[PDB]
Amino acid sequence: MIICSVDIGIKNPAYAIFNYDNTSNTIKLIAIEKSDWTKNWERSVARDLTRYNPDVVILEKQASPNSKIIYFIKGFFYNSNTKVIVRNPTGGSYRNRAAASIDVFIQKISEYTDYKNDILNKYTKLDDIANSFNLGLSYMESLL
Amino acid sequence: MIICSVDIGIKNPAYAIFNYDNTSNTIKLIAIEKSDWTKNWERSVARDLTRYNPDVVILEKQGFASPNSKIIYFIKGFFYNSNTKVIVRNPTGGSYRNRAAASIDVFIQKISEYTDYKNDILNKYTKLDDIANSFNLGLSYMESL
């Protein structure tokens, strides 16, 4: 089973891709990447989602130009075999949320990837990365 | 060529289906029906759009603050990379009731040129707002053709 969580944005989208092994009840992080959806966001989203052929897609619940992406994905995976689930954002002011997410990320990712240093060196801004990672985790917590 | 114009609404959706013959430069109305998208709007929209297998789909432009852009972009994703083109068109002044009145007048007087089935269309559907809207939207698209 392949899981695709997506922090949705135009200038700063991000996606985390997990592999779910129901046999071993374990979870392995495959890849988190920062994307760009400013030039033909439709084709960019289709590409980025179908790249790894996911079994389930997790979208962050958000008048914003991102609900169009939510429903574009919903229509794009409707007649397919991929389930699209929209989840709530994974307290305080809205500005504190990104800091809490980055802390939880930098402290929780080491259990899943073993590739922490290169992820931190490649991507300096950890907002959307942390958001997608925590969104995927919050979905999979309901599974186990 | 089959053209599908869609007046978008949850409790009051409507769709007009035209047949476009580029050879004869003529246009024939096939069917206009009022739909219901209150129970699983996703399945309802997929059903109503794939019903006649259209070559092009015409969608009404809606603001992001309206609960209908979700239907717009659901359709866009639903027909993406397919052989059906999805085009969003502008609404075909004053109050919404004056807009609907002008649309109903243009509809009730212009449909007879295309369907020959005016009397039964008027007898079946009493409220003509969204029906007229979808018909005029399809016409406004084909005028560009």
Numbering used by the authors:
A (entry chain B): 1 to 62, 65 to 92, 95 to 148
B (entry chain A): 1 to 92, 95 to 147
Q: What did the study's authors say about this model?
A:
Initial crystallization of C151stop Fpr with a catalytic mutation D135N to abolish the nuclease activity, in the presence of a HJ DNA yielded large crystals that diffracted only up to 7~8 Å resolution. Four additional surface conformational entropy reduction mutations, K65A, K102A, K103A, and Q104A, helped improve crystal quality and the structure was determined and refined to 3.1 Å. A HJ DNA substrate, HJ 13/13 with four 13 bp arms, was required for crystallization of Fpr and present in the washed crystals. However, no DNA molecules were observed in the electron density map and the structure obtained was that of Fpr in the APO (DNA-free) form. Divalent cadmium ion used in the crystallization reservoir solution at 10 mM concentration, was identified in the active center pocket, coordinated by the acidic active site residues, D7, E60, D132, and N135 (D135 in the wild-type). In the Fpr dimer, αB helices from each protomer form the major dimer interface. The dimer interface is mainly formed by the hydrophobic interactions, including F64, Y73, F74, F78, and Y80. A notable difference is that the Cpr crystal structure does not have clear electron density for the helix αD, whereas the Fpr structure shows a well ordered αD helix with clear electron density. In contrast, the active sites and the surrounding DNA-binding surfaces of the two Fpr monomers are not well separated due to the shorter αB and the loop preceding the αB helix, and they form a larger flat pocket.
